[PDB]
Design a protein around this ligand. Structure first.
Ligand SMILES: Nc1ncnc2c1ncn2[C@@H]1O[C@H](CSCC[C@H](N)C(=O)O)[C@@H](O)[C@H]1O
Ligand SMILES: [Co+2]
Lengths: 5, 269
């Protein structure tokens, strides 16, 4: 998936 | 007669003519290898074994879907985030001294690196609030525009972004997506992508613009085409708007009405 830095 | 898939002088010249009248791109004899390589893939995709067959189907059907694929095949889309970096600080100081919605037009957006580099500069200098700024990006290449729309890039390609820009405007892929990044929808919301052929006698764009980025694209056009587009831009620029050219371009050359105002930056009058 995708996430914040 | 031919060879196992051979490109004849005659076909190369027809291809040169066809791409020039559809996109304005001037191809040279020293590019006949790229042409062959980029185009045999289209022949294969369609199951044709002849360039003359391919060429004729195109000519006989001007509305053929293959025309867009033919154009996409011959365009050179090399671009990069924060390319010709010195332009961005200039864009920021200019936008900061102006009022009203700051509108920019990236006339040769390619895969999106340019329009997003502009959006980041402005979000950083102006903030992200409805009606503060807007970026319009276009290209004749529908493939690259699609890539731009998705806003997915390789993390290794963002060598020029500060950690604060990453943290602020991108999402990081993990697992199957590890190594990729995606521009956040919040910043993407301020960028509009459309297809616009610079050869058009009239641009279908939402101007006037405070700035127009027309970098590394004029180099593919001939003299009169370059001057015609430059003249089409004039009435599209707001009062003290800016026109940015690539490292190789000199606009004050074809039209003196444009004055150099920094590293490949021009202003009117
Ligand atoms: N007639 C035309 N109208 C619009 N875009 C064109 C064009 N002919 C070529 N192009 C586009 O111009 C792009 C140039 S690549 C340069 C991208 C960016 N401006 C940069 O400075 O990094 C290519 O992606 C190609 O599709
Ligand atoms: Co996924």
């Amino acid at each position: 998936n995708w996430e914040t830095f | 007669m031919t060879q196992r898939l051979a490109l004849s002088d005659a076909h190369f010249r027809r291809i040169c003519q066809l791409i020039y009248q559809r996109a304005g791109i001037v191809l040279a004899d020293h590019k006949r290898d790229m042409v062959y390589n980029r185009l045999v893939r289209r022949l294969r995709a369609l199951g044709l074994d002849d360039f003359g067959r391919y060429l004729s189907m195109l000519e006989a059907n001007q509305n053929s879907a293959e025309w867009q694929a033919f154009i996409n095949a011959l365009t050179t889309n090399l671009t990069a985030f924060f390319r010709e970096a010195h332009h961005f600080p200039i864009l920021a100081e200019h936008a900061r001294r102006r009022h009203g919605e700051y509108r920019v037009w990236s006339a040769a957006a390619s895969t999106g690196e340019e329009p997003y580099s502009i959006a980041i500069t402005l979000a950083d200098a102006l903030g992200m609030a409805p009606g503060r700024w807007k970026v319009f990006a276009s290209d004749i290449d529908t493939e690259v525009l699609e890539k731009a729309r998705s806003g997915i890039y390789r993390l290794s390609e963002l060598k020029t972004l500060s950690p604060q820009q990453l943290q602020r405007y991108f999402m990081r892929g993990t697992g199957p997506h590890e190594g990729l990044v995606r521009v956040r929808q919040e910043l993407a919301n301020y960028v509009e992508f459309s297809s616009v052929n610079l050869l058009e006698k009239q641009y279908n764009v939402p101007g006037p613009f405070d700035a127009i980025f027309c970098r590394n694209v004029m180099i593919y056009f001939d003299k009169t085409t370059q001057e015609d587009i430059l003249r089409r831009f004039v009435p599209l620029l707001k009062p003290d708007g800016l026109l940015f050219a690539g490292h190789s371009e000199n606009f004050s050359n074809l039209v003196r009405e444009f004055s150099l105002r920094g590293q490949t930056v021009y202003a009117l009058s």
